[PDB]
Amino acid sequence: SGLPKLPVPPLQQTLATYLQCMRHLVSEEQFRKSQAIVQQFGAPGGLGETLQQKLLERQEKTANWVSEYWLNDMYLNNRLALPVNSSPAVIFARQHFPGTDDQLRFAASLISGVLSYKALLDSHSIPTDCAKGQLSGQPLCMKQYYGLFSSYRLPGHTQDTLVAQMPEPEHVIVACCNQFFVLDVVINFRRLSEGDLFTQLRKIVKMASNAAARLPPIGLLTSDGRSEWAEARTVLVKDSTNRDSLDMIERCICLVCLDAPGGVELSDTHRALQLLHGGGYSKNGANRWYDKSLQFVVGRDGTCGVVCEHSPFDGIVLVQCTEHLLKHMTQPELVRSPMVPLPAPRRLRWKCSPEIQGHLASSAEKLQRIVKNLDFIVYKFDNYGKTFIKKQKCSPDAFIQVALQLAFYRLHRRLVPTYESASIRRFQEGRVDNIRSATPEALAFVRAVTDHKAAVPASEKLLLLKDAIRAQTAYTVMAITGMAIDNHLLALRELARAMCAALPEMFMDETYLMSNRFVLSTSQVPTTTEMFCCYGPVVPNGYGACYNPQPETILFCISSFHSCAATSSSKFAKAVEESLIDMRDLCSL
Ligand SMILES: CC(C)(COP(=O)(O)OP(=O)(O)OC[C@H]1O[C@@H](n2cnc3c(N)ncnc32)[C@H](O)[C@@H]1OP(=O)(O)O)[C@@H](O)C(=O)NCCC(=O)NCCS
């Protein structure tokens, strides 16, 4: 590759930044202790320098010194069930399917789109991406695109495994009524016609309606905790017939889920709930297989989108792919490719036992908990967007990040360690690092705005606001150029772990542990289309906030858990609105 390698920030720089990031987020006493702990860790000839040298050696010996640690720490090691906790969802615009054939026509076209997109990929014909927004123009890593259809996430007892692929024939798994069918799409590079795909889908729907053939909803098992699924899967593996079906799923291109009519109204919020967890076993919750990277949902009632397994790639790459797919569906149906004789799709067989029956019950129950615990809302701020923000000589993203801090503070009376996905695709195999938005400058601003007794003059609030945005931007530039701290500290941490299972004080420190519990987890997932991305929180008492800034509006997808009496997605969305209004008034002085 011609891309530069992810940089290794200097040790002292990361340590200084770290302490500064956390001083206002911990007690004075605790900070003093951390100061001393860090001083000792990074002292000349100390442990810090020994680990740093080992990191430089690792940087030289690998293409990306953090890929492995990051992949495990961020996803594979996580034991939580994938739905809501990990797998984000992208919702397409509302569709209208008068008859079942309309649904199947859409699905056929979509599958065709997928096939031509994958052809462009297999031929390395996809135009190399370039940075836009902050520091734009340089080439970006394209590795993520190659993980779109060739990946499967295997459950494990303690750590999962991301399997990187091509089966011939090449096929897609179609799920209907919780039944999984193998739909071959490419014989000898012969790509079935959009007309033949329609015909095959009609057959699938028909078979998926046969009572005497209906099999147990095995898909449900993949919606459980990772350790739980790993165990139920071990039970399944005992039988040869199940071993075959799993493999088929494991080697498919993707899944195409023909969801049953949802029960509630088709609002952006409800359509997203369906994409996130399917609404539980009583709805479309089992018509899935979360281990597979991409699950395209085409429901009978018009609810469409794609459920994504996070570990193999991030939302930007995903959105580019989907927007291309949808654009391809806007583009005219080509000439035909006709298949005579056209074999019938194969239904994956499962040999269930009393054991598996119990596992299905548990998973059904576990999933229901996720469904009722998710507090989600799609909020569209329409007073203004990027256009107005740019007129304030401000970075939209930074401005929005600051708005979220103010919303959080005005509602809960404190700032908390916050996470914002910062793409580092400027470097080989680059995924993301973290932008810590809960800066000291943000604190000074939110306090001025909310502390009535201080009576801070509006002119001063404006100054603090601009400084907060300046600091947000500075950290953003720092992160996207690989000079931030999270990935750096992670590497040092795991390198030490290799030396001795007993981590240094540095990483046992309550300050470090606290710095990584992201009560406010966020990310910008911009899209030109009518679509939007959403996901749940990463901690029991936290929020998930994915926004899409447009010229005149800003879409906010807010999530939290009903279990935490302290959080509330409706209240937070309201606080976001008020925060944006307040900031607007401040800039209009
Ligand atoms: C960190 C990050 C979010 C910053 O986003 P960004 O796109 O640079 O956003 P900004 O808010 O700075 O906005 C960029 C736009 O505002 C403009 N802008 C930025 N600062 C400005 C300023 N001070 N004054 C006026 N305009 C400004 C830019 O010129 C650009 O305008 P353009 O639409 O004509 O190109 C981005 O670099 C990133 O990493 N995005 C990836 C998110 C991701 O990974 N999502 C999936 C997670 S799994």
XYZ file of C-alpha atoms in Angstrom, residues 365-565:
201
model
C -36.497 -14.203 26.598
C -33.129 -12.450 26.399
C -34.130 -10.713 23.200
C -37.447 -9.547 24.654
C -35.449 -7.806 27.393
C -33.417 -5.919 24.789
C -36.595 -4.939 22.963
C -38.352 -3.501 25.995
C -35.185 -1.894 27.396
C -34.361 0.192 24.307
C -35.557 3.800 24.556
C -35.170 5.131 21.023
C -36.208 8.232 19.108
C -35.471 9.829 15.744
C -35.363 13.605 16.156
C -35.101 15.971 13.215
C -33.904 19.434 14.152
C -35.203 21.682 11.375
C -34.477 25.222 12.551
C -31.091 25.107 10.792
C -28.116 23.024 9.720
C -24.566 23.207 8.384
C -25.243 26.359 6.337
C -25.979 28.531 9.372
C -23.158 26.945 11.388
C -20.591 27.668 8.686
C -21.770 31.294 8.753
C -20.519 31.381 12.335
C -17.086 30.326 11.082
C -17.601 27.053 12.885
C -17.078 23.406 12.092
C -20.609 21.827 11.992
C -19.374 18.628 13.621
C -17.600 20.559 16.378
C -20.661 22.800 16.860
C -22.925 19.764 17.112
C -20.539 17.976 19.482
C -20.621 21.017 21.765
C -24.424 21.113 21.520
C -24.542 17.501 22.734
C -22.323 18.374 25.707
C -24.640 21.251 26.648
C -27.697 19.015 26.218
C -26.130 16.394 28.456
C -25.117 18.922 31.127
C -28.390 20.868 31.250
C -30.257 17.595 31.736
C -27.899 15.710 34.124
C -25.806 18.459 35.748
C -22.422 17.008 34.821
C -20.191 16.144 31.888
C -19.106 12.582 31.343
C -16.403 10.939 29.330
C -17.697 11.122 25.746
C -16.781 9.209 22.627
C -16.918 10.370 19.019
C -15.820 8.181 16.136
C -12.955 9.818 14.299
C -11.982 8.118 11.057
C -8.292 7.332 10.645
C -8.703 5.864 7.166
C -5.883 8.177 6.095
C -3.654 5.353 7.289
C -3.312 1.714 6.235
C -6.153 -0.462 7.566
C -7.294 2.596 9.478
C -10.564 2.221 11.351
C -11.204 4.946 13.953
C -9.775 6.574 17.053
C -11.589 8.635 19.688
C -12.415 12.344 19.905
C -12.993 13.126 23.581
C -15.614 15.853 23.397
C -15.990 16.313 27.169
C -13.218 18.927 27.177
C -12.447 21.493 29.923
C -13.610 24.226 27.531
C -16.958 22.484 27.105
C -17.362 22.390 30.873
C -16.716 26.128 31.223
C -19.274 26.796 28.495
C -22.050 24.516 29.773
C -21.608 25.885 33.301
C -21.908 29.481 32.094
C -25.074 28.642 30.207
C -26.772 26.651 32.988
C -25.621 28.342 36.212
C -28.229 31.119 36.570
C -26.681 32.355 39.815
C -23.453 33.097 37.954
C -25.368 35.417 35.639
C -22.661 35.131 33.009
C -23.192 37.906 30.402
C -24.415 36.624 27.039
C -21.338 38.181 25.436
C -19.137 36.022 27.671
C -21.205 32.910 26.940
C -20.534 33.525 23.239
C -16.790 33.697 23.884
C -16.875 30.469 25.889
C -18.977 28.917 23.112
C -16.450 29.807 20.421
C -13.574 28.568 22.588
C -15.427 25.308 23.221
C -15.850 24.856 19.475
C -12.192 25.759 18.916
C -11.100 23.077 21.391
C -13.467 20.517 19.811
C -11.950 21.196 16.413
C -8.399 21.024 17.747
C -9.047 17.576 19.255
C -10.755 16.508 16.041
C -7.686 17.452 13.986
C -5.538 15.690 16.566
C -7.549 12.450 16.369
C -7.916 12.173 12.597
C -4.177 12.604 12.157
C -3.472 9.786 14.584
C -2.176 12.048 17.339
C -5.019 11.358 19.792
C -4.750 9.041 22.822
C -7.196 6.147 23.005
C -5.540 3.821 20.457
C -2.107 4.715 21.833
C -3.024 3.871 25.441
C -4.747 0.685 24.273
C -1.567 -0.553 22.566
C 0.614 0.269 25.563
C -1.903 -1.506 27.770
C -1.948 -4.747 25.758
C 1.823 -4.727 25.239
C 2.239 -4.556 29.003
C -0.353 -7.308 29.429
C 1.885 -9.472 27.224
C 4.766 -8.826 29.630
C 2.727 -9.657 32.736
C -0.993 -10.361 33.231
C -0.880 -7.853 36.094
C -1.382 -4.483 34.398
C 0.543 -1.419 35.646
C -1.090 0.965 38.128
C -1.425 3.275 35.111
C -4.190 1.093 33.686
C -5.661 -0.204 36.946
C -6.210 3.368 38.059
C -9.914 4.162 38.540
C -9.294 7.283 36.441
C -8.336 5.212 33.398
C -11.218 2.798 33.865
C -13.647 5.689 34.217
C -12.254 7.459 31.141
C -13.378 4.512 29.022
C -17.002 4.203 30.200
C -18.619 6.308 27.508
C -21.870 7.503 29.015
C -22.308 9.570 25.848
C -21.254 7.646 22.760
C -21.545 9.442 19.428
C -20.735 9.640 15.742
C -21.546 11.549 12.579
C -22.916 9.393 9.750
C -23.751 11.855 6.943
C -25.841 10.761 3.973
C -27.139 12.470 0.847
C -30.059 10.038 0.631
C -33.124 9.993 2.864
C -31.530 7.269 4.991
C -30.100 7.356 8.514
C -27.928 5.297 10.871
C -28.680 4.431 14.496
C -27.440 2.284 17.392
C -27.795 1.719 21.118
C -25.636 3.019 24.050
C -22.414 1.243 25.119
C -23.021 1.400 28.899
C -26.188 0.763 31.008
C -26.517 4.422 32.057
C -25.513 6.017 28.745
C -26.761 7.375 25.417
C -26.127 6.650 21.734
C -26.276 9.705 19.509
C -25.726 9.350 15.772
C -26.329 12.519 13.777
C -26.667 13.440 10.119
C -25.946 17.143 9.463
C -27.472 18.591 6.294
C -27.497 22.144 4.890
C -30.733 23.097 6.652
C -31.472 20.268 9.107
C -29.777 17.856 11.503
C -31.161 14.382 12.081
C -30.540 12.948 15.542
C -30.948 9.255 16.381
C -30.982 9.034 20.181
C -30.904 5.832 22.210
C -30.794 4.961 25.912
C -32.071 2.191 28.208
C -35.404 2.405 30.050
C -33.678 0.506 32.863
C -31.655 3.563 33.854
C -33.944 6.035 35.634
